């Protein structure tokens, strides 16, 4: 299964998709970015993975932050769902990349945002977070929160 997620940065707004690997615990290789329409491809063994949204109304200096469980079975049929969603001012996010008791997955996450009007490229990372993505997901939570 190949499935579209969204990674844009216009003079309006940023969407900043990024799909994740619970089996290798740190972000997918995606074969094609595409900068002609706003979007990444993914080659994905069909399992878990978790979707890290970013939205960015850039005249509102606003950014809401979703997290969303991808679940597609040996069938490849997909079946989504948001297990977080938070709202706040764009200036925040842009502050959480340069704090350092940060979780590193989202601390790193906003640092692959968009080039201006390109596309986040996912890297070759053989580095991988201690925590599973339960305890990763709420940590990321337990901060944001504090961090609003
Ligand atoms: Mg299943």
């Given at each position: 299964v190949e499935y579209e997620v969204v990674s844009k940065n216009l003079t309006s707004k940023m969407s900043h998709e990024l799909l994740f690997s619970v089996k290798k615990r740190w972000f997918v290789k995606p074969f094609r970015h595409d900068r002609q329409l706003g979007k990444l491809h993914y080659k994905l063994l069909p399992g878990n993975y978790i979707a890290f949204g970013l939205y960015v109304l850039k005249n509102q200096d606003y950014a809401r932050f979703e997290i969303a469980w991808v679940h597609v079975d040996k069938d490849g049929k997909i079946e989504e769902r948001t297990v977080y969603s938070i709202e706040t001012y764009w200036h925040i996010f842009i502050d959480i990349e340069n704090?350092?008791?940060?979780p590193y997955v989202l601390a790193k996450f906003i640092e692959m945002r968009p080039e201006f009007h390109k596309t986040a490229w996912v890297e070759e990372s053989n580095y991988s977070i201690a925590e599973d993505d339960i305890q990763m997901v709420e940590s990321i939570k337990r901060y944001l929160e504090r961090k609003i």
């Open positions: 704090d350092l008791n940060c």
